[PDB]
Amino acid sequence: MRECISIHVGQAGVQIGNACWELYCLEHGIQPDGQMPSDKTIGGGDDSFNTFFSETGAGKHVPRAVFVDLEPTVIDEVRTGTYRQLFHPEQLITGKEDAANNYARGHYTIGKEIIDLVLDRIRKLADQCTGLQGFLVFHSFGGGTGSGFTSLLMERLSVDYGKKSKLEFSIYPAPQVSTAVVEPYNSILTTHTTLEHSDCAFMVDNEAIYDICRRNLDIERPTYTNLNRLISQIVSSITASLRFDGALNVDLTEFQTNLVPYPRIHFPLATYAPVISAEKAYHEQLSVAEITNACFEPANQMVKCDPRHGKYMACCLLYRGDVVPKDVNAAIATIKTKRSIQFVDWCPTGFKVGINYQPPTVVPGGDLAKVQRAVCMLSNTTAIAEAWARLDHKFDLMYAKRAFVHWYVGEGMEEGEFSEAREDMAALEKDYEEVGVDSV
Amino acid sequence: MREIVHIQAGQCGNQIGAKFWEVISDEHGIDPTGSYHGDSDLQLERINVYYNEATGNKYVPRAILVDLEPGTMDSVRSGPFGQIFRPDNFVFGQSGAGNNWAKGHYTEGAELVDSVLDVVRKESESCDCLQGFQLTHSLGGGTGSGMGTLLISKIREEYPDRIMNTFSVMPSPKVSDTVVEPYNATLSVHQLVENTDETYCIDNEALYDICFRTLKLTTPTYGDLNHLVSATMSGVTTCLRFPGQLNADLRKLAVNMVPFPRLHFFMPGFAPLTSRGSQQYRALTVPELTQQMFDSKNMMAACDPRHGRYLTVAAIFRGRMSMKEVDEQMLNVQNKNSSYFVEWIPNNVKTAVCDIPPRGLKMSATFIGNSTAIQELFKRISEQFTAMFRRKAFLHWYTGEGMDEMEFTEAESNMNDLVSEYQQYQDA
């Protein structure tokens, strides 16, 4: 019951998907051949982990997932990799020619050749569900598949599944690892197209993640495998409430209720702690009180925003591991005293907390220390709009001279589609401003 | 006017419903399997009020357990008295209400409400003479709040001449950080003004403050909060459960407590205040039960009764004690604090005395006051509500299920009327 289907679109989407499902397997004691010695309910089950994993006769626990890409290189590595046996081939879907960093190719020219097949396979997963919660969609803002095909799929999923929840994990572009000059363009287009089809979207700023890998893990020049391993921990935190349960556990949909005041204001800010090396973590254990404080240090934010110059509309704390109510309560009391934390006048100021006792694990040869307890804060702050602004400025500079616009028109798009996407983005920044204003 | 049908809806509803049955079962000498093993015969005199009888003279609660997710009911069924309940009287869905009144009252709940009413009907035909129904639920979530008020509106339709009683847990930010609870509560109040005869206003603000201040519990749990509710519910229904003279059925209680059809929101108090750890070796004196049960610290509603005036009061004393002294101390409060009782309802304080005391105490006092100060509670919610509604915040959860802004405006409006009506008679 309450199953959740993950959809991993494009390179970023797929590679992050790898990290995530490896980690989930390590969290639930699932081997790379799908077998799970803990599960005595053979062939079936009602357990918490069954919302992300189906079971088979052989005793094999199978990710409720689909990996889609318009080119086979990245998914091919999955097909041949450590966790090859974990999936069924019908779940790994590849084209031949990618979208060449072109939204238009992803949404139309190449995407249309494969959208039906993907939906057919998504549908086949939905049929295994007693009661589907919704979908999780992992994608890059910048790629052509990540942007264009994702918009197409999301639109198609709105139609085929009506209003079943659709959550995004969107990789926001950073210059230190950008692959295309036109990623601002692709970003604004997918964001606009997906906006009214997405219930809730967790933006991951790569510059933020690159920053944290450099600073807290002393990684000299972070790789994708570096960012992904950190990103996976964060996703794991957010999905923990869906995959585990205990008395103190609060369902993600409950956090969602607090976090989204209006259907367009559905972009929460993630801040995670502790991110700490094994060298620093040795002999130094971090308290409930200590990790809670980190959540309000912008260095630990997942998007480069400044919540201090913005107003709060909500605060959630997703604790996992060795955390007790008593300590959490005292911890928040501190921060209520030691910080200022302005809320808008129309929202209350209570923090919705959830706790999963199941402690964070780490992937072998990871760079992250194996901690006893950890926390992810989900905040709805006006400051998240800063992310749109930086991207909207980058977009503006190029479209002024119609730079690169011709690779898009040639695939079938119009200038009208651009100006339109950009107007939605302007409205969204305006919207994110309107909510910060005080009432009368 | 003999049998009562009990219902409990949602998380809060089922948890306190369960604890309520745990408690009175122990008082009426009924074990988890349903057999009787008690000394006094006062325990079985009006046992037919809340329980049914079966083969082997086992006693089965007249209780219907309702939820939109299986969670709390699975937990209750494997709870202590779990197997005591009629298995068929477990009626649950799987979708949940997501703390949404609209989901509870209009969509996800409508999909289930008929099936519940079937079990209600089956119980009501077993009744030689039905008084009415007592519901236990929170006003802050979705199932108990939304589906609960729907069940009332529907049950009033099949049994309009019966009495509708509720134990309604009012939300507080001190206990819940769900932002929409003031929406859920305002919508529910509108329903309760219209379609209940009696409503016990169990305030989670009060219960938390009581647990933290008086009982010195630094990390109050639901079990702590519910131990207080359990005690109140035992006391308030004592005049119903054992042989007595005053407020001995729901209709009579209503007639004594309700001077005007809408103002039926009661302020419960209790003494001595007890935590599950507290020793309570020293029984209190009758004068101590009295000074406390009128003390704001013992009120379960988080209102200052000195800010308004008592329209009516019931006061129930339990355990072996001087019935002579009970009257003097009772007549003392009335005469000491006479300004706090309305003059235009003579002798508005009525008293009963039951011999059997509550589990673990020798002397207990329960308070039932129809104070005008109850408005402060509704004023509290009203403010938490408008703070959001003026910016139309979080309404999309509700409009998305089919509701309209106008329906909010009217529930806002009808509760503001309620407050003003409670203020009309406070200056009389």
Binding site: - | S75, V175, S176, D177, N204, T221, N226
Partner: peptide, 5 residues
């Protein structure tokens, strides 16, 4: 506020 029966 973190508050379990």
């Amino acid at each position: 506020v973190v508050x379990x029966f």
